[PDB]
From Swiss-Prot, chain B:
The gene is csy3. CRISPR (clustered regularly interspaced short palindromic repeat) is an adaptive immune system that provides protection against mobile genetic elements (viruses, transposable elements and conjugative plasmids). CRISPR clusters contain sequences complementary to antecedent mobile elements and target invading nucleic acids. CRISPR clusters are transcribed and processed into CRISPR RNA (crRNA). Cas3 and Cascade participate in CRISPR interference, the third stage of CRISPR immunity (Potential). Involved in crRNA production or stability. The keyword RNA-binding does not apply. In this bacteria, Y.pestis-subtype CRISPRs do not confer resistance to phage DMS3 or MP22, but instead are required for DMS3 infection-dependent inhibition of biofilm formation and possibly motility. This is CRISPR-associated protein Csy3. It holds the Pfam family Cas_Csy3. It comes from Pseudomonas aeruginosa (strain UCBPP-PA14). One of its GO terms (biological process) is defense response to virus.
Curated annotation (Swiss-Prot), chain C:
In this bacteria, Y.pestis-subtype CRISPRs do not confer resistance to phage DMS3 or MP22, but instead are required for DMS3 infection-dependent inhibition of biofilm formation and possibly motility. The chain holds residues 327 to 434 of 434 of the full protein. The gene is csy1. This is CRISPR-associated protein Csy1. Disruption phenotype: Mutants lose phage DMS3 infection-dependent inhibition of biofilm formation while there is normal biofilm formation in the absence of phage infection. Decreased production of crRNA in the presence or absence of phage. Disruption of the entire Y.pestis-subtype CRISPR region disrupts crRNA production but does not alter phage resistance (possibly OLNs PA14_33350 to PA14_33310, and the flanking CRISPR loci), indicating this CRISPR is not involved in phage resistance. Belongs to the CRISPR-associated Csy1 family. It comes from Pseudomonas aeruginosa (strain UCBPP-PA14). CRISPR (clustered regularly interspaced short palindromic repeat) is an adaptive immune system that provides protection against mobile genetic elements (viruses, transposable elements and conjugative plasmids). CRISPR clusters contain sequences complementary to antecedent mobile elements and target invading nucleic acids. CRISPR clusters are transcribed and processed into CRISPR RNA (crRNA). Cas3 and Cascade participate in CRISPR interference, the third stage of CRISPR immunity (Potential). Involved in crRNA production or stability. Interacts directly with Csy2; part of the Csy ribonucleoprotein complex with a probable stoichiometry of Csy1(1),Csy2(1),Csy3(6),Cas6/Csy4(1)-crRNA(1). A Csy3(6),Cas6/Csy4(1)-crRNA(1) subcomplex is also formed.
From Swiss-Prot, chain D:
The gene is csy3. It comes from Pseudomonas aeruginosa (strain UCBPP-PA14). Coiled coil: none annotated. In this bacteria, Y.pestis-subtype CRISPRs do not confer resistance to phage DMS3 or MP22, but instead are required for DMS3 infection-dependent inhibition of biofilm formation and possibly motility. CDD domains: Csy3_I-F. This is CRISPR-associated protein Csy3. Belongs to the CRISPR-associated Csy3 family.
Length: 76, 334, 108, 333
């Protein structure tokens, strides 16, 4: 079910994990030591994941901070 | 029933400081007290395209179009002055001692069992092995990480301090002393008796470490690099900052502390590569590998649980590993 | 249309509210946006005010505004291989054209 | 045996920033107290010569354009009016050990890489690469535009073991060609020194000093810095120049660009000349990228086909691949 981590360096114990559900993938912002997640977002394929992710404003870990601030957004 | 303590925390011993770098001339080496500092400055750089492509869209017109718009960039460098060929790196080091007592623990029986285990270790054999390997890491120049690579002569001077004075001075030669072979010496046995007398709590140990390296006239020194993160915001900022103190380049303290605790020659996988530093789940961040897996029985948590709770004493060298992790300190427990 | 017309509302709210635009730091990159947000003339202005910024029809802020729109919304390249970015680029072409066409008479 | 996902090679042949100081020819052997070339400002009012959209039958916009031309402030560096010789000094370390990466995931891929590079060195030495490096130190590639239009260029190279000089070389850069790598006894000696340096058989530190007759009060050409638009014209909108403490200078990576112009093995044309060694071997000024990945001469393609599959390429392409390992870089995914 688990595929990979989205970033290669943890920014204060937090990282985005990429999961697989069948015909869709599940990106999920989560703590690493504990395991409990803070927000999630469902995509259809990994091409949508990389195509959406590489369009974010930033480079390196500013991109992963913007992605964690995007997936774990206050929904209301 | 003796479960583990849910809260454990060990304060570190062997506390270093931030190393300062100042440049000067060799054979003006004994008067290295008024040397000016190495400053961090800016310069501009125009890169190109050299990264690996992808076999989904790599057209020749897109490559030439990529070369039409290159990367303009601003970095920080630190160089010696053009009339100086010697790097001076100075830091200090305290050796605290009392390396068995935690700073926070829930249980009282588990803490007393832990102190009986550590006191049993010290009474069976001293701190001579660990202080011998620490003395070898102060002997050569591990704490000169990339500055050591490609140098004519590296000289290390170590002082012991009791008051506003100097008790005993050592002067070594870092290139003659090996990088991988821990061979004995009289002076290293003296300084290993000093550090081993420090970790046992039999006195106060403050050391002053000064390192000298011939690099070349106007060459480049290598301070430690700071964290930025480009969030796509204004101005196209700097892509390489360097750590500094008040107008001097410097190295972080935890990187020197990484260079001092490279003890572990007891990997299950391969003892042919060399000693890499002491960690629970003993890992190397640059190599991307994690030696000493928990699927084996050589992890720090597994050996500590099997040696405190169940009295199953491991081999002697693994006991050196466990006590090395207690001198490292950390946040243990659940 | 509502984004660029909303930017016209931003210059609207900036225009008739804060007439004080004196000297301060940063007058090289905020100098084209200063001539875009043309304030009132100073009371100590001499006769050299009908030549200092009279010929200032600032069509460069449609270019900086174009870069802000390009960095704001994602421009897909799978729509670039199709005609969606030729028709889309036509839409931003004529819309920024009409925006600058409003900007043709900011002073005159 | 897949490729390692992380590869990184530290560079060898590490230069420093070159300093420029001006003086008089035939006072050339005492070139030790010469004053530095300083960077100063001057004002420049430029006209409009942009390629306008043609068939513009509106001359009122043209005569309107002359009413406010470009008022501009630039930096120049000139020799003093009683000096006609440019002195450019820098140093150079030759590290050696050009096969071992600094970061690698796999252990089998790294051992296969070290067997491949050690196989290359055992089959043939570093004599070719050190011969071409010796030719780029022989002439004055590192004098980029300062070389163009000069009466006589003299290069002095010193080898340093202690606070001393082991062996000194004195060349003539205009007699030595720009495109023809012809052998010589002294270039074979210095090529033995560099080849002895890259193999790890010793420590090599060189001091390179270059001399050029340009003219009294002419213009020298330091390297140019990057300007952000937070500064106005009075405030150098136009043209800043790189400097050190009150002296004009050249960046270190530009001299490092001038040293590694080896590649005479393009598939397209060997008639133009050697341009420097890059993966996807490209020229930024010409806007072209030789050595395309659609061919089979790219560095990544040859390295994958020569490490993983034991398909050894031609000998000159092996010189190209080892030249990219001496260059160093960030490889892998």
């Amino acid at each position: 079910k688990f595929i990979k981590y989205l970033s290669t360096a943890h920014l204060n114990y937090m990282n985005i994990a990429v999961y697989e559900n069948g015909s869709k993938i599940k990106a999920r912002v989560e703590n690493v030591v504990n395991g409990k997640s803070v927000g999630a977002r469902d995509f259809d394929s990994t091409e949508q994941l990389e195509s959406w992710f590489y369009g974010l404003p930033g480079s390196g870990l500013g991109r992963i901070e913007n992605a964690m601030n995007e997936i774990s957004r206050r929904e209301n | 029933i003796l479960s583990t303590a849910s809260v454990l925390a060990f304060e570190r011993k062997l506390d270093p400081s931030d190393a300062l770098m100042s440049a000067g001339a060799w054979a003006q080496r004994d008067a290295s007290q008024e040397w000016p500092a190495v400053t961090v400055r800016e310069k501009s750089v125009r890169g190109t395209i050299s990264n690996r492509l992808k076999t989904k869209d790599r057209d020749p017109a897109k490559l030439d179009a990529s070369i039409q718009s290159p990367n303009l960039q601003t970095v920080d460098v630190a160089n010696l002055p053009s009339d100086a060929d010697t790097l001076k790196v100075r830091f200090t080091l305290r050796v605290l001692g009392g390396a068995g007592t935690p700073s926070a623990c829930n249980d009282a029986a588990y803490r007393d069992k832990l102190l009986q285990t550590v006191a049993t270790y010290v009474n069976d054999q001293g701190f001579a092995e660990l202080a011998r390997r620490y003395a070898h890491n102060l002997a050569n120049a591990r704490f000169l990480w990339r500055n050591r690579v490609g140098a004519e002569a590296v000289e290390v001077r170590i002082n012991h301090i009791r008051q506003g004075e100097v008790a005993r001075a050592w002067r070594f030669d870092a290139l003659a002393i090996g990088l991988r072979d821990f061979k004995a010496d009289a002076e290293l046995d003296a300084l290993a008796e000093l550090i081993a007398s420090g970790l046992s709590g039999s006195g106060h140990v403050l050391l002053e470490v000064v390192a000298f390296a011939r690099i070349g006239d106007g060459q480049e020194v290598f301070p430690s690099q700071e964290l930025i993160l480009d969030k796509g915001d204004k101005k196209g900022q700097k892509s390489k900052t360097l750590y500094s103190v008040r107008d001097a380049a410097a190295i972080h303290s935890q990187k020197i502390g990484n260079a001092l605790r490279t003890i572990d020659t007891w990997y299950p996988d391969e003892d042919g590569l060399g000693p890499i530093a002491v960690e629970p789940y003993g890992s190397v961040t640059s190599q991307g590998k994690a030696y000493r897996q928990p699927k084996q029985k050589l992890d720090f948590y597994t050996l500590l649980d099997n040696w405190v709770l169940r009295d199953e004493a491991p081999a002697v060298e693994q006991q050196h590993y466990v006590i090395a992790n207690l001198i490292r300190g950390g946040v243990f427990g659940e | 249309a509502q984004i660029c017309d909303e930017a016209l509302q931003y210059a609207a709210r900036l225009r008739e509210l804060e007439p004080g635009w004196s000297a301060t730091p940063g007058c090289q990159l905020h100098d084209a946006e200063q001539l875009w947000l043309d304030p009132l003339r100073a009371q100590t202005d001499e006769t050299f005010l009908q030549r200092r910024l009279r010929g200032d029809w600032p069509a460069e802020v449609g270019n900086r505004f174009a870069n802000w729109l390009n960095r704001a919304v994602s421009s897909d390249s799978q729509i670039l291989g199709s005609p969606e970015a030729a028709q889309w680029s036509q839409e931003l072409s004529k819309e920024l054209t009409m925006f600058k066409e409003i900007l043709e008479d900011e002073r005159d």
